[PDB]
RNA sequence: GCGGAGGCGUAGGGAAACCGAGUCCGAACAGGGCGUCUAGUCCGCGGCCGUGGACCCGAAACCGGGCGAGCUAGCCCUGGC
């Protein structure tokens, strides 16, 4: 990528033929990101409290 | 994160021995009910359940141990009236 020695870089082969799975993709990867997210709190009663 | 031991299927059916897209009864080529493009598979969300008390408190009691007669008891010691 450099400009000074090394010039040209190109890509996409990976799969142009697609490219059209949004809904899944963005969803999903949501989701872990909530869980790391450390949530501490209790709850109380049961029987006796 | 790197890190394969743990599942459901990829078959069934049969007490089992174990046979097989077929199995089991029966002496039976036969009768008869259970077999095959059965895509499934794991996510979050959710039904909907299992322990959970899992909706909300609550009824007189049963169990354990602590408190217990500075009231009422009975006698027990001795002062009194």
Do not use: F, M, Y
Not at 2 to 19: K, N, Y
Request: aromatic letters at 4%; charged letters at 30%.
């Amino acid at each position: 990528i450099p400009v000074l020695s090394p010039s040209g870089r190109r890509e996409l082969a990976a799969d142009l033929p697609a490219e059209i799975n949004p809904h899944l993709l963005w969803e999903v990867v949501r989701w872990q990101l909530a869980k790391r997210r450390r949530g501490t709190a209790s709850t109380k009663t049961r029987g006796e409290v």
